[PDB]
Design a protein around this nucleic acid. Structure first.
Ligand code: SFG
Ligand code: SFG
Lengths: 249, 249
DNA sequence: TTGTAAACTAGCCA
DNA sequence: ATGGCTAGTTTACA
DNA sequence: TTGTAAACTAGCCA
DNA sequence: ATGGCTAGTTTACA
């Protein structure tokens, strides 16, 4: 693996003390949602107050590892987002709530509620002096859309010439099983949304921590974009896929 | 004023006793977000624990008006949604977190966070037997998309033939000032999303309560779909606009 | 054009 | 306090 | 084709 | 403690 890519097949809650405090620039956290998925383990088989008690345990181990300029993105479901975000507001300050629109809805067969098509991403910061660089994540227009948005009043603006803010709603399809990026992990996140978080909230060459890296999407996003990565995954098969993914760029 | 459609220029919190308990099928609440808007009053000038205390007060008066099959939609901002939704889960059951993608982002000039393009709507129910009808709110395909979505496995299914679930993310654009639906209210909500709430969670002939009706968007929806309405608005100017919007049907 | 899986069925009845 | 019936659920990748 | 407003700037300094 | 000044922010209505 490259220099700052550290892939650890260890339980994060047992091996976090090994990680030095105030040593991480960004935490990309995609922990189990509490939704009953199979990760080769029972991490997602926890529910209710037991899941919320576990979430706080790992968070109180990860927050100290954050530099005074560090930030943190946390994925969760709406079923536990209000409580998770309420706790993290007493430990950090919330900069954004990012809604990942997965375009493809969750299946099941219900007709008594609207279908799940969104995950909740909480953007928190340690202090008001958090590192945020928008320019590498600006989305530039194409020729046609730039012509449709340009006015004499807007001419010369950075949103029109360089690119606009991704906003707090990111419409990106989930990865199909046959998608080129897809690997053998049940909850693989698109590289597009993870790379955006690293390029905007981790200073170039800084260290990013994925307490639960799964298949190493945050590692790939840190290999390219030149950022340092520390990742923990209990599953060995997942840790393997992670290496292969970082050993193919 | 049509029958069943009831408009009041009063404070909801003081006139709550006038509303019989367990008499309302659906509460469509668009309360002040706590963002500093000017409705001719200072109701949106409350903040922090002052706003959440007032939110929990009106919610404690509005909840016992829901009959056992009742439901409630409440708009808010991500800055207070975790706290608001955490309190309501202690009183009611959360069925859904609907994200309104307003398509058009909020303005200001920031480059230190992602821009706001979404409001949070909470779908809470009093009990597990809440009324919910999806057929009136199913979105039928057009000739081109149904051709792209149709497979022999899906042929005959309600979603492909009748229409799909609108999902928990609603991409409806905010109303431009020059839009023909736009009236002189600072935060008018599109009738498309209010009618969806009324058609899915209120039976025809049922009663809808809007404690902060504003320009009367819910009054217009209840009138056009055969639902009874009760609304409150401290601003007489907005109350007037609410009258014209209903009487123009 | 088409097969097919993707973080988030549920209400009855027994 | 608990299963197992049912009708039932979208999009976009290859 | 073009003007224009829409629930959610932010740090600095005289 | 307080404006004011700055560089700065998108779509889709008409
Ligand atoms: N204590 C733990 N330490 C490290 N990893 C864990 C722990 N508990 C669960 N995990 C793993 O955390 C992962 C959570 C996943 N949602 C990560 C997905 C990852 N972002 C991906 O794109 O593949 C699962 O694969 C679990 O096996
Ligand atoms: N105690 C109160 N009682 C009744 N109305 C109030 C109260 N406080 C604030 N309001 C009004 O509630 C409204 C909140 C608005 N978001 C309503 C918008 C409304 N949904 C519309 O589509 O026009 C404002 O117009 C307030 O003037």
């Amino acid at each position: 693996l490259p220099s700052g890519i550290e892939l650890h097949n260890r339980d994060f809650l047992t091996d976090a003390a090994h990680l030095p405090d105030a040593s991480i620039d960004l935490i990309v956290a995609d922990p189990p949602y509490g939704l009953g998925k199979d990760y080769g383990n029972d991490s997602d088989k926890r529910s209710g107050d037991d899941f919320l008690a576990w979430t706080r345990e790992w968070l109180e181990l990860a927050i100290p590892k954050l530099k005074p300029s560090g930030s943190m993105y946390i994925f969760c479901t709406w079923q536990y987002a209000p409580e998770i975000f309420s706790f993290l507001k007493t430990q950090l300050t919330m900069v954004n709530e990012i809604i990942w629109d997965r375009r493809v809805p969750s299946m099941g067969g219900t007709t008594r509620r609207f279908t799940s098509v969104h995950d909740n991403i909480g953007f928190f910061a340690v202090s008001r002096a958090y590192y945020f660089d928008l320019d590498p994540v600006r989305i530039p227009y194409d020729a046609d859309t730039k012509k449709a948005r340009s006015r004499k009043l807007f001419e010369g603006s950075k949103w029109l010439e360089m690119g606009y803010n991704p906003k707090d709603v990111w419409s990106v399809s989930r990865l199909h099983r046959q998608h080129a990026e897809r690997v053998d992990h049940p909850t693989q996140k698109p590289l597009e949304i993870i790379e955006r978080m690293v390029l905007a909230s981790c200073p170039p060459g800084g260290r990013v921590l994925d307490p639960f890296m799964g298949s190493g999407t945050t590692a790939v996003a840190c290999a390219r974009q030149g950022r340092d990565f520390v990742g923990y995954e209990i599953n060995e098969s997942y840790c393997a896929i992670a290496h292969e993914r970082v050993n193919a760029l």
